[PDB]
Write a protein that binds this ligand. Sequence first.
Ligand code: MG
Ligand code: ZN
Ligand code: ZN
Lengths: 301, 1259
Amino acid sequence: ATADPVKDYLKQIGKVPLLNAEQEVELAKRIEAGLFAEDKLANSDKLAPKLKRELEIIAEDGRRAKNHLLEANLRLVVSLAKRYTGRGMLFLDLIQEGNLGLIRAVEKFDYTKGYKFSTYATWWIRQAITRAMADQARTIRIPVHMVEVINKLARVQRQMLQDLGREPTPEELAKELDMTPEKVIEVQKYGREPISLHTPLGEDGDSEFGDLIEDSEAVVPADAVSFTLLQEQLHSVLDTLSEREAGVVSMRFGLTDGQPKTLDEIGKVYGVTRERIRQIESKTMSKLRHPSRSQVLRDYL
Amino acid sequence: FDELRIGLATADDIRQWSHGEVKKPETINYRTLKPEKDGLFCEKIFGPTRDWECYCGKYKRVRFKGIICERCGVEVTRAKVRRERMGHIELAAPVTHIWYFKGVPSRLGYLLDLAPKDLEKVIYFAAYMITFVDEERRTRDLPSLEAHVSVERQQIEQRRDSDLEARAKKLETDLAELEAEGAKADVRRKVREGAEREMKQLRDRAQREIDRLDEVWNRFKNLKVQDLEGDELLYRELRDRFGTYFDGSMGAAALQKRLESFDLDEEAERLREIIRTGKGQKKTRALKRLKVVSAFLQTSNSPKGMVLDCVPVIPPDLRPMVQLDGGRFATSDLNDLYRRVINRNNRLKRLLDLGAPEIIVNNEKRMLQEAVDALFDNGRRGRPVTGPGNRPLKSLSDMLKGKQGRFRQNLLGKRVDYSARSVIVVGPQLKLHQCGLPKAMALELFKPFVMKRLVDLNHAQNIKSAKRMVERGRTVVYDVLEEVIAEHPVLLNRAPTLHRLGIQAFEPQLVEGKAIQIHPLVCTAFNADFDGDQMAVHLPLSAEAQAEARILMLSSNNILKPADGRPVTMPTQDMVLGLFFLTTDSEGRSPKGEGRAFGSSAEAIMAFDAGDLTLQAKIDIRFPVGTIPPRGFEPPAREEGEPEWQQGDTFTLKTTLGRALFNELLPEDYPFVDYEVGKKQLSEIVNDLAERYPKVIVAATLDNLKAAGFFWATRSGVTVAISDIVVPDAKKEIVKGYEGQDEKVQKQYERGLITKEERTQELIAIWTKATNEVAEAMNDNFPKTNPVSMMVNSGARGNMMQMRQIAGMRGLVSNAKNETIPRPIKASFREGLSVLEYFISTHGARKGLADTALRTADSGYLTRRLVDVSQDVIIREEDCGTERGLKLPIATRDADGTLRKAEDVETSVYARMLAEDVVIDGKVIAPANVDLGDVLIDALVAHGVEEVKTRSILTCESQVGTCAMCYGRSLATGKLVDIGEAVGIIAAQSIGEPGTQLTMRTFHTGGVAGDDITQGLPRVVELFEARTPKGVAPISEASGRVRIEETEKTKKIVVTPDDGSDETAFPISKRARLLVGEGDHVEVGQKLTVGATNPHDVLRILGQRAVQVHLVGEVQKVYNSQGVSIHDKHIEIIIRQMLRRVTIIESGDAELLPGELVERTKFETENRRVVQEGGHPASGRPQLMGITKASLATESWLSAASFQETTRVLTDAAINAKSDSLIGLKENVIIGKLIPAGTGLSRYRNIRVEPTEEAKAAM
Ligand SMILES: [Mg+2]
Ligand SMILES: [Zn+2]
Ligand SMILES: [Zn+2]
């Protein structure tokens, strides 16, 4: 009810009864009792209503025992989640994801292996915690196999650093891990953490890092003025040429509309051969290629 | 744009705004850098990231715009739509809003009658809540449940009796068998002790089972709505034992289930009932609860929105993730907070998918609620979500607030295009309206105009070639630039911009160098000093902007400062010294050619160039026809036998050459000024010129004065060698005598006959006497010829204190924490200090620097608060129909046989308007509705009037705003104020301008704290904040008998008013000073203890006029103590905006809440409409409130949102569903519409222009 809900959660765990061996094997037997009983209830066969109510009571007892096992094992998941904390994900979120891993773990347990719950649960705790850390910690999502590759590379790079006391070349790390050096460069480029936009610059407080960046998508008024003047000048030089030449060039690059047209496409509405239409087209390109009608367009690029 | 609404946004509104669900937390792909599908930054929901492209790579063409892609669903459109398109996140379990819950209780509101700690318990998943109870069903079957409980008790008692009988039989059996076996001598005692231990333990668990049954019974017996249960076991056993009777839940869903069935109209009804009858803090509780609940009744917005089910998302541009150099990425913290909320919502959905324990689900819902709270307010509760480990993440609100918020950094003040900045240099060759821009500055500012003119002048074929030449920078570009920038004003501006004259439109002019060349005549109005001060140049752009620059803003139209009407564009540093040397009298300087006639000024100039006549020498110089004689020379005209007039005729004058030159500077129509000019008389001359000549003539005359002042100050004979600074020769013997008597005192103190404190007091007294005496000797020493006196006695630059502590001794100088060293600095700066004397000087110096830094900070703060409180008052009527006014005194402190005018008439009565005609002998001396200048006030005080009735702004009543006539003539134009002039901002700036100029601090407290009232700027801000001053001076409520009651623990005063009035008692401390007579005569006028009176009770017991006079007089007596002159109408505007709120009482027939903040006009309208209905009106008392409280309590919530408390007023507007009319200036600056002041009024924008018929007939 106060601040620091980590303390509130730890007290919300409370004085749960820790389970010595016969207690949790009896609880697991009751789990099986409830689960097989509700499985029998799930069948569509008609039995006595009293037997159905008894099986429902067993199912409720099994659910209660499942709950009790959860509150018994919230201690171990808290003790294990703290091992992987302070790495971009919050401590209580790690606790909750480990709780997901533990409720996945206990569901897949059988009493045939006479082992304690710790050595079987810790595998799923570590697996779910590292999967959640791979999936949700970074702002850009990295798949779990990429995460395990990159942090294996990080740990062997740290081993190299503590071994020879010097920064290794990427070629050495590539050849000692049997991947290509360009792959190593790519994966350590991928393995980066973004910096927040709202970082203060220094003594000044109003000046932030966010106002220093520009945007390439911003429209430049000079560019738009150049574009509309290019359109106007192109229309003017089209009007400068002959009417038929203007008409044939207006369709070859589809200047009038959004679609260009081929020489065979315009040979029906106007009715000339491919030879003549391409000849007059190339004549128009040559005439516009003359240096007289170039300075009006050469600076326009 | 007519109205801007606000309110609670229910989930329907969020879904209407939204375009999809942000189901997944990830933002962008890690290799292709493309936005994800149905996650954050989604192109399907928010829009495409390129222009007319879609996510799946198809549909790249522009022709088929406005269609939906089949593969990926991305609409093809512009990339800017991602600045305006939002989605939403669907939360599995509802969460509360941190703005309403966990805030000021005036906005939490106690809508549900719950303590805030109870809310913390219930909605943060630590204590249960009962949402609904079938009370009538529970009470319907009370005998049945009572019979069941009785049956349970009966069977409990029966099994207890059976167990007791069995235990007794077992105890008897074991005692008998261990007493018959005889295993040990006293084994029966041991087994009996064990049996009785079993007895007591089993009896304990029996009483304990009885106790839990009793406590659950009495807990269920008193269960009702709004009931909490901290213990989870107790709620669980109520659920198990008792079913389908009471409905309860857990978390914010409890608040939603309560609010969906919350009956609030009858709540307001019974709450009004408890308002009607009661006493104590219950009145305040019910008052706040009714002022909050009644908002939901009148307004149509449902109160569902306090607890929310959906969370809208910022569009992705406003929370960007921008690519940088080197592959690094930068994202806003909003994306991280949204990612946290989405992750926790997905995990909660996963837990709800399967069967999960209640503790885990409750913890997940709690962390979801806390993450949503951190999104809305990171750092409101508990430790903020840090992130990287250095700083807290900034939430939505964290950028709607403060200096980094949108209201204060990107809406009121914005960056601008077409602007430039460089250092400033002085140019005497400029006119009054000219400034010199560099070539590069003028090319970059006027670049598009240069390209337009280059294409017009066909130096380049098209626009691109013109830009290429401009970037290359050929000489033809500079030539066409010089052809363009003329007749095109620019706005120059200094960064502090303390008052209205910080922005002045000049005409640019091409100069070399890299500095802006600025007229010296105007640099003092900028506070500009050429020590690397950098001035920004802004370019008016359209026709309207440069027209307002030319007409309203020009530097040749801003002669008079609006603070006091005094001229400010005649500086003093160098030209005043030149004119002083030009016009002073020949004292101490050998006058050559003294007393010889000259035919004209040309002959005098020829003689002065020859060298036989000095510049200042009493000569008879004849003047040509048309020269107006002096004011004092007209009656003593040259004696004439026939009738003649010297008004236009020639004349001879006994004046020097220099005064003839000075009157050649001034225009020919001005009378011959025939005195020492100095500075003050120069200010009077410039004031008269501005009052009696057009603007262009005044600009020309000040330009001539500048040029000649510089010319003669070059040859004035000022310089500072160390021989010019002279120490008094008597200072040696004066200091010798004083140190001799100090030595005598020191050997007197060595015997212990006097204390250290008394010796210190008398020593600082006698050393202050010594420094005053050597200052007088220094004044008696220097001649008029040395340049330091010539530049300090002329009003040029410097004060007598500085010359006192350069030539004479430095005097007494303060220690740390404001005391005085007994040993003063006996060495002058010309002589040079010693080591430790210089150390004690540094003590004062660093404290002074820190003091002026904090002083300018607080002055800026006070200026901003005054601007907010005093804005949105604009001259909006030509004239009122009123005739009421203020009885301002005009003649005061008259001696025997003579009448004298008031000393501060220049700031109080001047530049006002008479309410009515004044008559003394049946004839009007001054007509109504005219300004009061020198001549009219002199005529009135000569005729023998004592007080005048000036039509000021405090008495101004009008339909809207204030009128021009009731305000008085504007002090910045010299004429009547035009309708539309924003007088409020001018008043606020004029009050806030000399805030840095006060430079006051309490020198010494006298060894006691609290005896001295606040001085300087803290006194001003304490006065305008309407706070009670630190030195409280109580005022008697009525005349009567007052005596003292000197109780040992705490002093006491008692006044008993006569005429049967009730006794009132004032508490006074055991402090040193009380000035009232015991058993003496007292009345309402005086104060029981000398000190600052608390103005609240002054208003309460004296009246509105008395408190207005007191406030104006106090702030003016603070301002007059330093030399800064502020006209009293500038204060009167803020005081009128200060007393506008009225506090009402006994409002049982006016059907509104009694005892809150009520506007005066609204209260009067309510009174009119309730006396029209026949009901008796409600009473009301005026409420003197501070500038901040009056600024927050305003009708337009945009202006209050732009001020300090920007979260409380936003929540207040959302709760009250108030929409603000856009009358005002902050709310029109933000939107970008034209402000309704000056040119932006309706009566000015609605003009239609057409040429006359003869005009078009001519051409
Ligand atoms: Mg400076
Ligand atoms: Zn597509
Ligand atoms: Zn008026």
